[PDB]
mmCIF file of C-alpha atoms and ligand atoms in Angstrom:
data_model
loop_
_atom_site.group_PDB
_atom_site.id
_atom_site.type_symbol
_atom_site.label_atom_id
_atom_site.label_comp_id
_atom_site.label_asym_id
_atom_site.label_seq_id
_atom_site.Cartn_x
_atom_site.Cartn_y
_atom_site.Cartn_z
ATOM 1 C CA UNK A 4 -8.392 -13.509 -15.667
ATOM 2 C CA UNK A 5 -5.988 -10.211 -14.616
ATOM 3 C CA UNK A 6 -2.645 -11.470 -13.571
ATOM 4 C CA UNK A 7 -2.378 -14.986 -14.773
ATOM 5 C CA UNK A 8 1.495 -15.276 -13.703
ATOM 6 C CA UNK A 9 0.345 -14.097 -10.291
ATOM 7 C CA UNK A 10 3.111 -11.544 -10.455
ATOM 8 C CA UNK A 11 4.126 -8.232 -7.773
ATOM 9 C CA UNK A 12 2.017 -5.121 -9.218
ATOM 10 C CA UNK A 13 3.402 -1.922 -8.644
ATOM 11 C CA UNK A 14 1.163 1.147 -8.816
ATOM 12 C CA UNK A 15 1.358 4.672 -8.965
ATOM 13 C CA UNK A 16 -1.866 6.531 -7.888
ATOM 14 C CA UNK A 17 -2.571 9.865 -8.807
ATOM 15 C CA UNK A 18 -3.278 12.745 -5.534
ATOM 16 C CA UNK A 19 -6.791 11.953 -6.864
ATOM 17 C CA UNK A 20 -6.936 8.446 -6.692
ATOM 18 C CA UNK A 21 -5.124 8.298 -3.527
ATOM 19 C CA UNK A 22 -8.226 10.084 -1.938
ATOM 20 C CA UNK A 23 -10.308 6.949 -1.419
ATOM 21 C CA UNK A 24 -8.728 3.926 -0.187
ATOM 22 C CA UNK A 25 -11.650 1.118 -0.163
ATOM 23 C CA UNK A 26 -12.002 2.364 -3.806
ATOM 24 C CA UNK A 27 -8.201 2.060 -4.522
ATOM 25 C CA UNK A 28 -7.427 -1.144 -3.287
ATOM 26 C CA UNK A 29 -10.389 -2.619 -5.000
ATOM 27 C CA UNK A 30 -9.482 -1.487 -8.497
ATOM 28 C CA UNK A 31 -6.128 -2.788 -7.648
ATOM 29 C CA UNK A 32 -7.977 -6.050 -7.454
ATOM 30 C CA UNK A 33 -9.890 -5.359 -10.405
ATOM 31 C CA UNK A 34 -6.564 -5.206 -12.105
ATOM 32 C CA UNK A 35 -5.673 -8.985 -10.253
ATOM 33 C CA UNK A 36 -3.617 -7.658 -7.825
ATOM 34 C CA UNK A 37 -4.457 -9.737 -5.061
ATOM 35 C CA UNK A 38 -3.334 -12.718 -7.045
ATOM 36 C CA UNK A 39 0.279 -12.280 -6.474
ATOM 37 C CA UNK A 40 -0.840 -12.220 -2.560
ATOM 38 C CA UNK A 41 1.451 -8.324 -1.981
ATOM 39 C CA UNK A 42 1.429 -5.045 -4.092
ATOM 40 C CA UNK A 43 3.438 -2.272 -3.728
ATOM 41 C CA UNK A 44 1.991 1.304 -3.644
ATOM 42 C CA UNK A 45 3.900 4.183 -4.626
ATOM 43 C CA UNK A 46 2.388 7.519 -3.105
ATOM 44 C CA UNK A 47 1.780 10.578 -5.049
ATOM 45 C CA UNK A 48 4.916 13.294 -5.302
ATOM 46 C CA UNK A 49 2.657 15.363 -3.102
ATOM 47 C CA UNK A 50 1.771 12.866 -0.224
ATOM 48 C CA UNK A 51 3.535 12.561 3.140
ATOM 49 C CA UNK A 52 3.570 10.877 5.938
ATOM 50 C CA UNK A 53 4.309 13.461 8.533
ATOM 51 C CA UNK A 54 6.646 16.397 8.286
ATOM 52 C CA UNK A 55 9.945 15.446 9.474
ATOM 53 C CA UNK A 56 11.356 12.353 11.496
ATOM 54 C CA UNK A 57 13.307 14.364 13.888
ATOM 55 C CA UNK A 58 11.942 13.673 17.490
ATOM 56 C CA UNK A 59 10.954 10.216 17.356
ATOM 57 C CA UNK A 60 14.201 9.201 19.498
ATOM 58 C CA UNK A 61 12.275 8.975 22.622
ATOM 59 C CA UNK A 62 9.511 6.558 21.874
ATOM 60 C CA UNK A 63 10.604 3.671 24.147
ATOM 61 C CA UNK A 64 11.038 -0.058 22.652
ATOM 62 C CA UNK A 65 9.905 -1.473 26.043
ATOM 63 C CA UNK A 66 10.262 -5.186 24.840
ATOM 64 C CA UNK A 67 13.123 -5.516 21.874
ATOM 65 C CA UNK A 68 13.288 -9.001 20.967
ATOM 66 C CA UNK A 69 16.200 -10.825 20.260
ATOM 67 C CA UNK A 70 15.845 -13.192 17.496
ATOM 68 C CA UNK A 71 17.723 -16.561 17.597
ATOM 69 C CA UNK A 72 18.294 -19.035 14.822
ATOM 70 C CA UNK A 73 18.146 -23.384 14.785
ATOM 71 C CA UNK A 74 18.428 -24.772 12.219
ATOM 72 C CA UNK A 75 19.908 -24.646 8.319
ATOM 73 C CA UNK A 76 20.953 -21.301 6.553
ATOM 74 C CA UNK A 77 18.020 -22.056 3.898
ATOM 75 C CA UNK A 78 15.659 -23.849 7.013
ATOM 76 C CA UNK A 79 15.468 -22.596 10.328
ATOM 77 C CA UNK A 80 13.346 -21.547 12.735
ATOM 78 C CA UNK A 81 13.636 -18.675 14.773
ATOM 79 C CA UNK A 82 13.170 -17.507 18.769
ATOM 80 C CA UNK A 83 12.270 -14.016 20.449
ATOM 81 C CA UNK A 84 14.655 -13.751 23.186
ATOM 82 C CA UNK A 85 13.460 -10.568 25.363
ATOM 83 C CA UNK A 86 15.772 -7.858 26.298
ATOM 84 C CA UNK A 87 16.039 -4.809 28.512
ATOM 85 C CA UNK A 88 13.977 -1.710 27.418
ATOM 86 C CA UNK A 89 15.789 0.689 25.018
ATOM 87 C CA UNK A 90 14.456 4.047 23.615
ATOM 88 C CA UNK A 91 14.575 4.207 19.448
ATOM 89 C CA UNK A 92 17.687 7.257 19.867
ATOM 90 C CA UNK A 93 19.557 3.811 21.700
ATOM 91 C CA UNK A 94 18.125 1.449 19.265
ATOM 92 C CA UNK A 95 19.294 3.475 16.247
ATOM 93 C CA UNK A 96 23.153 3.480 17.767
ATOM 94 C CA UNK A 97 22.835 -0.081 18.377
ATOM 95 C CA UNK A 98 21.856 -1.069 14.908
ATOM 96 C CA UNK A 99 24.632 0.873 13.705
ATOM 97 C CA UNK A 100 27.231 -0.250 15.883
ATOM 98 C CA UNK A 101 29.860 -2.671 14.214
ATOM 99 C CA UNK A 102 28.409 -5.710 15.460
ATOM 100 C CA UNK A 103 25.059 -4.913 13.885
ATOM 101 C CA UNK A 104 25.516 -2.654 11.027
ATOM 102 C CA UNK A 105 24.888 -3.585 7.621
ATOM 103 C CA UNK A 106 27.788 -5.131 5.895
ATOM 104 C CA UNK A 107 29.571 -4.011 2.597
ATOM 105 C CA UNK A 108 27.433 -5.006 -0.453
ATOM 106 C CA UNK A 109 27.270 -4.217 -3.904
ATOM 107 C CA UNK A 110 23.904 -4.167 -4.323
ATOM 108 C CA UNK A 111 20.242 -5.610 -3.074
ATOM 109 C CA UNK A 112 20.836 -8.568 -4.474
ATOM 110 C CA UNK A 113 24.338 -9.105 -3.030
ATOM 111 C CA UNK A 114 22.658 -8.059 0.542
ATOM 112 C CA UNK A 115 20.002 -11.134 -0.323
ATOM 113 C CA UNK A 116 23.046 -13.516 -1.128
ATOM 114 C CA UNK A 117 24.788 -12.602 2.396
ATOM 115 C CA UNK A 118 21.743 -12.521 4.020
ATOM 116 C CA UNK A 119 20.670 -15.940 3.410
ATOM 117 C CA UNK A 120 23.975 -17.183 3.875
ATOM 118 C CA UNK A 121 24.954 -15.685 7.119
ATOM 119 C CA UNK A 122 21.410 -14.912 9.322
ATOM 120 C CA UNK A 123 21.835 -18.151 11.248
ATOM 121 C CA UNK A 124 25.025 -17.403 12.416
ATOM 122 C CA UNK A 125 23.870 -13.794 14.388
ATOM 123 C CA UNK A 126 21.176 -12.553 16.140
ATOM 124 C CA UNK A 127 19.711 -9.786 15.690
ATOM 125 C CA UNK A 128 17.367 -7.407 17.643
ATOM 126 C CA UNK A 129 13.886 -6.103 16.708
ATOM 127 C CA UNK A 130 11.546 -3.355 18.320
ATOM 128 C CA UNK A 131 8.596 -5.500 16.806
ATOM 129 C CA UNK A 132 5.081 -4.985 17.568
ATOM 130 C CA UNK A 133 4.665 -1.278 19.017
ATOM 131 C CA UNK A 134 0.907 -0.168 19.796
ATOM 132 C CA UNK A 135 1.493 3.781 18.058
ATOM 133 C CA UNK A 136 1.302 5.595 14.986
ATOM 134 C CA UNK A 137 3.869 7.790 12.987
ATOM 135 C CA UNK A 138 1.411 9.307 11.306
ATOM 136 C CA UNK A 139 0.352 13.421 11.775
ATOM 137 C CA UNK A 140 -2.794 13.579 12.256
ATOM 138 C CA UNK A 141 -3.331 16.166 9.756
ATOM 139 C CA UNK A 142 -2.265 13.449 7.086
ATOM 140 C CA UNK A 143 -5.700 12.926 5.753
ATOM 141 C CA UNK A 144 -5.188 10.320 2.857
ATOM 142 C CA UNK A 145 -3.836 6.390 3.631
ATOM 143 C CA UNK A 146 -3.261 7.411 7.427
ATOM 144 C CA UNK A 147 -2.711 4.181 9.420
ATOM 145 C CA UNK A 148 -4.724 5.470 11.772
ATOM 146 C CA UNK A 149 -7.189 6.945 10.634
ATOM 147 C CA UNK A 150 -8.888 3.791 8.542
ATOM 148 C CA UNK A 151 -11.838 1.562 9.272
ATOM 149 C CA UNK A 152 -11.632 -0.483 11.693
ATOM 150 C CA UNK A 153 -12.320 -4.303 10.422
ATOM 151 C CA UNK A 154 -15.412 -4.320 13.174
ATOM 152 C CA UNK A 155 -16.841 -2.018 11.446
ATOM 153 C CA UNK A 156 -16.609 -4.010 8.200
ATOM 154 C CA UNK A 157 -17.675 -6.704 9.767
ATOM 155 C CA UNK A 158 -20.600 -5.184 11.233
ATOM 156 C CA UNK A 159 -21.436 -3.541 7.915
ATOM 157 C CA UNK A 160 -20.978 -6.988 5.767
ATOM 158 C CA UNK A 161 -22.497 -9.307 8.561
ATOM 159 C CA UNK A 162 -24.877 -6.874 10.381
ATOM 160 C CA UNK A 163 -23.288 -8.112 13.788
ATOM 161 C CA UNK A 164 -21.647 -5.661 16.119
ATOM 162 C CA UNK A 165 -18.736 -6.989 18.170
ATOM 163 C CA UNK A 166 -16.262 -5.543 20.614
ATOM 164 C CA UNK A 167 -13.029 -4.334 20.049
ATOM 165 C CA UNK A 168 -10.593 -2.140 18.333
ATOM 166 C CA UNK A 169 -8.569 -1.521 15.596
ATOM 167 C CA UNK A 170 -4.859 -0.070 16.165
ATOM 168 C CA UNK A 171 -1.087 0.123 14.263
ATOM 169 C CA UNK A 172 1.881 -1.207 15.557
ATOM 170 C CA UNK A 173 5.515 0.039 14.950
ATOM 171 C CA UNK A 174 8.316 -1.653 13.642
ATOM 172 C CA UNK A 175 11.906 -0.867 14.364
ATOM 173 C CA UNK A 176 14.178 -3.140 12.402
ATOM 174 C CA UNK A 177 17.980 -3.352 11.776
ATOM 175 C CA UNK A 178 20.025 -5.499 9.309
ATOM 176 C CA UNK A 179 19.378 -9.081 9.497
ATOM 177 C CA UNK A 180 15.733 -8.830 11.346
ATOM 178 C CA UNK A 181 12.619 -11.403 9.982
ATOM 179 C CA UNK A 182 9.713 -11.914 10.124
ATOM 180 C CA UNK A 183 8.956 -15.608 9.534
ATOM 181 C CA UNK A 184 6.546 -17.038 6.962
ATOM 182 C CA UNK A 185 3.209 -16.428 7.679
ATOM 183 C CA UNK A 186 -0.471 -15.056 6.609
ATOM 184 C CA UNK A 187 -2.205 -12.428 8.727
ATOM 185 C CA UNK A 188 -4.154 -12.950 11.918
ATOM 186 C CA UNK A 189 -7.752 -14.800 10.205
ATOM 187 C CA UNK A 190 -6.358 -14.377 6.801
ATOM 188 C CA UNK A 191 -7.076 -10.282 7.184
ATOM 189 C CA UNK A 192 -5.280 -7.950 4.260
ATOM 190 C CA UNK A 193 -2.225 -6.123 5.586
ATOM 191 C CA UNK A 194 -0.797 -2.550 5.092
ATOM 192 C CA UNK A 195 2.733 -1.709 5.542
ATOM 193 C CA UNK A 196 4.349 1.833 5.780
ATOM 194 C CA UNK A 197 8.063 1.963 5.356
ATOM 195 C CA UNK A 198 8.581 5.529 7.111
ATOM 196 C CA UNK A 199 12.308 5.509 7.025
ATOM 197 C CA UNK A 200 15.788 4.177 7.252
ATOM 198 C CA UNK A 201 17.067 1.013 5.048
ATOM 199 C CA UNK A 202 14.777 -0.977 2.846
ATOM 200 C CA UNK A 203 12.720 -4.001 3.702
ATOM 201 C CA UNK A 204 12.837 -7.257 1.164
ATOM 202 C CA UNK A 205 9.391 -9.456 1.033
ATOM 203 C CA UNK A 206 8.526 -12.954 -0.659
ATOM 204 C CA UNK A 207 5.014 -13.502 -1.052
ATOM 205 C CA UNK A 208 3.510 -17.032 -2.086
ATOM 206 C CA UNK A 209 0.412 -16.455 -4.645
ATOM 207 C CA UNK A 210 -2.973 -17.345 -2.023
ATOM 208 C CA UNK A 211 -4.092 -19.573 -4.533
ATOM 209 C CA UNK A 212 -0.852 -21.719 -3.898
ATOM 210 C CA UNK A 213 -0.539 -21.066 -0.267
ATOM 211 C CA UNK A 214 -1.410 -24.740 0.552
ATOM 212 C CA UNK A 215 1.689 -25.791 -1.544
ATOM 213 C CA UNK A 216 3.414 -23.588 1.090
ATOM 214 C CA UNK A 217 2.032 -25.529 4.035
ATOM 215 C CA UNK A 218 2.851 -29.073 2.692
ATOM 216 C CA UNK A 219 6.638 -27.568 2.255
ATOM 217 C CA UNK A 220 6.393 -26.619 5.418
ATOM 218 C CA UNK A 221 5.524 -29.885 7.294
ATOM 219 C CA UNK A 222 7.530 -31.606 5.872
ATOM 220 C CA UNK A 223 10.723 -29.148 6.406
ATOM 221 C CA UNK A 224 9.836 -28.406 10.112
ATOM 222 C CA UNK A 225 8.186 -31.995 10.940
ATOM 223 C CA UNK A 226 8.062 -31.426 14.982
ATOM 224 C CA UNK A 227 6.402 -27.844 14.717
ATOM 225 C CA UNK A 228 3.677 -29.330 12.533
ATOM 226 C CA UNK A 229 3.143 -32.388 14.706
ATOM 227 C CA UNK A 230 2.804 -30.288 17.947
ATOM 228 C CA UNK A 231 0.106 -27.598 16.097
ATOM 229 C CA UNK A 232 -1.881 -28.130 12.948
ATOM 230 C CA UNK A 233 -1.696 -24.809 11.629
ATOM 231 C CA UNK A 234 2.338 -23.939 13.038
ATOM 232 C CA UNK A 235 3.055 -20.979 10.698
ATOM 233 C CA UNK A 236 1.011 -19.003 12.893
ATOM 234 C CA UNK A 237 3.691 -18.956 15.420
ATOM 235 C CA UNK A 238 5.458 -17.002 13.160
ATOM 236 C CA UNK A 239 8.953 -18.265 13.572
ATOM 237 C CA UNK A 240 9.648 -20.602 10.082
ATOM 238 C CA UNK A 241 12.288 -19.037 7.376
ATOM 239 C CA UNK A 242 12.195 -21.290 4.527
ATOM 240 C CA UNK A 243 14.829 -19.545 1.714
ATOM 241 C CA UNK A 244 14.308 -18.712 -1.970
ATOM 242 C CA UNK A 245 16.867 -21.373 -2.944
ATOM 243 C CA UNK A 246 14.859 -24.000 -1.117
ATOM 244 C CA UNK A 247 11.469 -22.654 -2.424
ATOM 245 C CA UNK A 248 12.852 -23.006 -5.470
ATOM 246 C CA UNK A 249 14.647 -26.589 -5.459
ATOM 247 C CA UNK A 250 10.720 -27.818 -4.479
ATOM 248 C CA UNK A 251 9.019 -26.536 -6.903
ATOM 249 C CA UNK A 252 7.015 -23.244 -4.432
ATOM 250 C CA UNK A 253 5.822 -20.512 -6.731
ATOM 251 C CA UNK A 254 6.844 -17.238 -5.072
ATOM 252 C CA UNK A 255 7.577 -13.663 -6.286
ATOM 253 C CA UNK A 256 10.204 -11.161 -4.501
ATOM 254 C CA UNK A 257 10.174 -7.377 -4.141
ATOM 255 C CA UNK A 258 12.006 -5.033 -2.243
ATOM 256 C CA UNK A 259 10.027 -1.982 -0.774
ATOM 257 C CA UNK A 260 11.969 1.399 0.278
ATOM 258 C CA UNK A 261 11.150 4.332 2.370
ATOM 259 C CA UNK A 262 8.416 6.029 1.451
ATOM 260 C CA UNK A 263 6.263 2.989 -0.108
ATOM 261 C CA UNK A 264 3.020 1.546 1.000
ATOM 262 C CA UNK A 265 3.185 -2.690 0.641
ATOM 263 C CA UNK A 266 -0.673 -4.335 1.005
ATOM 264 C CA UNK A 267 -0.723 -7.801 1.825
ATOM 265 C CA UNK A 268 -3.737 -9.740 0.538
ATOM 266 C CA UNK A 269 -6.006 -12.601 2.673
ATOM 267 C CA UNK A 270 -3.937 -15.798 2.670
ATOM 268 C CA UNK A 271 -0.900 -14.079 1.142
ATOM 269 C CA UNK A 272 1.780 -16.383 2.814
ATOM 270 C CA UNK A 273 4.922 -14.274 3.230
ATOM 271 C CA UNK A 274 8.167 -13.468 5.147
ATOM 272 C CA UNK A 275 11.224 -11.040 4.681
ATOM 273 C CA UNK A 276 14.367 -9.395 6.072
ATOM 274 C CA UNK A 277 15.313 -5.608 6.863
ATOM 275 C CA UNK A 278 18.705 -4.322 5.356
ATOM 276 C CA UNK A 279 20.118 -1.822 8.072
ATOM 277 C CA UNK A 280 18.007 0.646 10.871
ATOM 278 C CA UNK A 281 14.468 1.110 9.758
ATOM 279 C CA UNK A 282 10.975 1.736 10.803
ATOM 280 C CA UNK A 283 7.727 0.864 9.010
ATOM 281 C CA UNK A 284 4.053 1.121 10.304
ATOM 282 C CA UNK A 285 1.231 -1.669 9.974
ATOM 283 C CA UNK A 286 -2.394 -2.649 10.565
ATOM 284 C CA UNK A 287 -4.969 -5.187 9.428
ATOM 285 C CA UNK A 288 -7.820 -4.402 7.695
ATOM 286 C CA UNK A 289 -10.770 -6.455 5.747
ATOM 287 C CA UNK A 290 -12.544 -5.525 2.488
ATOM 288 C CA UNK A 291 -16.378 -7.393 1.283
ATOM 289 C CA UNK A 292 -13.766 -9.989 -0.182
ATOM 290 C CA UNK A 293 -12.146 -11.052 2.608
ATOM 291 C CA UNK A 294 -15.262 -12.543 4.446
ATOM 292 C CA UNK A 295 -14.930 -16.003 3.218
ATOM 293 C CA UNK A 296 -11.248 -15.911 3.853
ATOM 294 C CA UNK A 297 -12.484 -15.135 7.532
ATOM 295 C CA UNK A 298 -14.505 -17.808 7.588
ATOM 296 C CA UNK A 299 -11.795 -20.160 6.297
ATOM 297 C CA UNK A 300 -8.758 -19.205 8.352
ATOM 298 C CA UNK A 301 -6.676 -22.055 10.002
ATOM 299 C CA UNK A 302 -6.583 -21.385 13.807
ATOM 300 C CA UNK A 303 -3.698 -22.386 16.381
ATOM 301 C CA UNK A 304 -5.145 -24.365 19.217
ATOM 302 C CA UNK A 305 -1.930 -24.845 21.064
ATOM 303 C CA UNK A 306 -1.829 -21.867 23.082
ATOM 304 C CA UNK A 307 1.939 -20.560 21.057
ATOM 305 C CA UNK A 308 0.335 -18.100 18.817
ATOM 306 C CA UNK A 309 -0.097 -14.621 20.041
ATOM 307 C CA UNK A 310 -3.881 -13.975 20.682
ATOM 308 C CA UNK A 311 -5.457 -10.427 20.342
ATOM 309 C CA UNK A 312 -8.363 -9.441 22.231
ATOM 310 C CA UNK A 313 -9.886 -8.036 19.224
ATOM 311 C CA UNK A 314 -9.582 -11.994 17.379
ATOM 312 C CA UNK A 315 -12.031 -13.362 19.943
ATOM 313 C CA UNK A 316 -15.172 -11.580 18.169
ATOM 314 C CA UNK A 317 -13.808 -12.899 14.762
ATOM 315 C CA UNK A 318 -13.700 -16.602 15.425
ATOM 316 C CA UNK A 319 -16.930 -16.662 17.380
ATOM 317 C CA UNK A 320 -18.534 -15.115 15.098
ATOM 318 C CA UNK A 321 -17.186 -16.182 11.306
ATOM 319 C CA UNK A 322 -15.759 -19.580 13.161
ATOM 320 C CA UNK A 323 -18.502 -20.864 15.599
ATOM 321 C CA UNK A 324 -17.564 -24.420 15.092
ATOM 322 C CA UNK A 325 -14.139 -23.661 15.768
ATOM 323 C CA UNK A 326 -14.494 -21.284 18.522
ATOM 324 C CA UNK A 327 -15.081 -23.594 21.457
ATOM 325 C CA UNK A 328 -11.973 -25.430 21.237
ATOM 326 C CA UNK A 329 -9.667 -22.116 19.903
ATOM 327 C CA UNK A 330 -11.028 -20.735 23.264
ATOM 328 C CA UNK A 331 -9.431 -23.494 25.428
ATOM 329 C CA UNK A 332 -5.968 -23.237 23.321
ATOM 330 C CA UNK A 333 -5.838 -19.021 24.248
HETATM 331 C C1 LIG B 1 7.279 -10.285 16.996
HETATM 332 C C2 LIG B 1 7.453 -10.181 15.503
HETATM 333 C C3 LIG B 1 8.619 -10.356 14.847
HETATM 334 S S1 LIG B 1 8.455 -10.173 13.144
HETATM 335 C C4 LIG B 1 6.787 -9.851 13.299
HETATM 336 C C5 LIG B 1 5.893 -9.574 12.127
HETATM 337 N N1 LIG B 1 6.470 -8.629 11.189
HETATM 338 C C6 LIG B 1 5.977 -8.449 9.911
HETATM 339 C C7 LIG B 1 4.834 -9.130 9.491
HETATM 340 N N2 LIG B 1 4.304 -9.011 8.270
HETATM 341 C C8 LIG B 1 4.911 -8.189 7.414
HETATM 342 C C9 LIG B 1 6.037 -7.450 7.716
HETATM 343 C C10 LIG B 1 6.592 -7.576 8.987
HETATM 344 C C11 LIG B 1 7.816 -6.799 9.326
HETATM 345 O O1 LIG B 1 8.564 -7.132 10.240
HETATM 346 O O2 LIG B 1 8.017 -5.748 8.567
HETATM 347 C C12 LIG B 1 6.400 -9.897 14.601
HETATM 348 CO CO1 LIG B 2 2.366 -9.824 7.947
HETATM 349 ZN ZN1 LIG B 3 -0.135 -23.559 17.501
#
């Protein structure tokens, strides 16, 4: 077995390796990757995103969400309040601002320290969730856009072809923005650009583990688990490494700058923080491997998870049993 320890791999492809990306990510795999449930990828010295970051200020942040804290510093859950529409040129100045800014720190792991320490006590605001791309189009190798679409995968695996579509989102962050524990929409694989601006610290729980996870979970946040049987979805639990510790959770860390790919894996529980103003770029995507994952992925049936037309096609086809009364809950 690759990867016993279930550790963060960090890789470094070659311009030539980075030309196929099925092929990539599966000898990452090969290599036990996936066990650690996130991998960093480090782009060749060649590879870009785009040319230069200079007139993205007027792509507009119609919803920014505020996000509000209850709870503990190690155990609280968090709520999106919405806010006016800002453009990213007013976002930027607003993460910098002295009420937002990032604080004097010594280092990353003095920023983790303060971090878990003080989040509870502000609220911070995050352009989360964006429909675009900050990709050129010209970028021919690990474009965001520009992959397969996981109905095409599915149609190629199953022989089924379903409706919908397969799109990024944006992510404008500032210091002290989360995103809560949780494992992609079905259990899918994730891909993460950081294109700019501060860094962006992740835990991961190992997927073979990610049960442990969930029992932690109900019994630290025992009215969200009561109200929905699979609660994490919501997306809005913060559980900290000092607590993950103290009950025994395995879990790895990593921090990922600008200019790094991160790639999730199928029921790769995980949650993290953004240090100052930053923007990354994500999509789902599925592989042969994560079919049974699919076909095994806990579904919220209390209506407070945030349902994609495109998720229909996957639970009615991978989760017929479950479909019926997932239906009724969306
Ligand atoms: C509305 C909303 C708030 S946080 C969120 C999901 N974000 C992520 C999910 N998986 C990995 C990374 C992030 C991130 O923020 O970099 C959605
Ligand atoms: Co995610
Ligand atoms: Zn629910």
């Amino acid at each position: 077995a690759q990867n016993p320890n279930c550790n963060i791999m960090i890789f470094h492809p070659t311009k030539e390796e980075f030309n196929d990306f099925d092929k990539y990510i599966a000898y990452m795999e090969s290599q036990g990757a996936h066990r650690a449930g996130l991998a960093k990828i480090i782009p060749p010295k060649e590879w870009k995103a785009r040319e230069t970051y200079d007139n993205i200020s007027e792509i507009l942040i119609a919803t920014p969400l505020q996000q509000v804290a209850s709870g503990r510093a190690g155990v609280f859950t968090q709520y999106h309040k919405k806010k006016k529409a800002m453009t990213v040129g007013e976002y930027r100045h607003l993460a910098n601002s002295k009420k937002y800014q990032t604080p004097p720190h010594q280092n990353f792991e003095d920023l983790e320290r303060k971090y878990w320490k003080n989040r509870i006590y502000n609220s911070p605001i995050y352009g989360a969730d964006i429909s675009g791309s900050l990709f050129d189009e010209n970028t021919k190798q690990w474009n965001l856009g520009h992959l397969g679409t996981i109905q095409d995968l599915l149609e190629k695996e199953c022989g089924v072809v379903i409706e919908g579509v397969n799109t990024p989102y944006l992510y404008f962050g500032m210091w002290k923005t989360t995103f809560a524990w949780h494992t992609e929409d079905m259990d899918l694989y994730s891909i993460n650009y950081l294109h700019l601006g501060e860094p962006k610290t992740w835990y991961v729980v190992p997927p073979e583990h990610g049960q442990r996870l969930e029992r932690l979970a109900r019994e630290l946040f025992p009215g969200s688990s009561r109200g929905c049987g699979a609660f994490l979805r919501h997306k809005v639990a913060l559980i900290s490494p000092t607590v993950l510790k103290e009950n025994g959770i395995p879990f790895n860390r990593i921090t990922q700058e600008a200019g790094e790919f991160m790639v999730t894996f199928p029921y790769g529980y995980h949650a993290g923080f953004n240090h100052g103003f930053n923007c990354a770029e994500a999509i789902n995507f599925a592989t042969p491997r994560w079919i049974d994952y699919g076909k095994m992925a806990s579904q919220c049936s209390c209506g407070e998870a945030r349902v994609t037309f495109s998720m229909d096609a996957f639970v009615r086809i991978l989760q017929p049993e479950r479909y019926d009364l997932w239906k009724r809950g969306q």
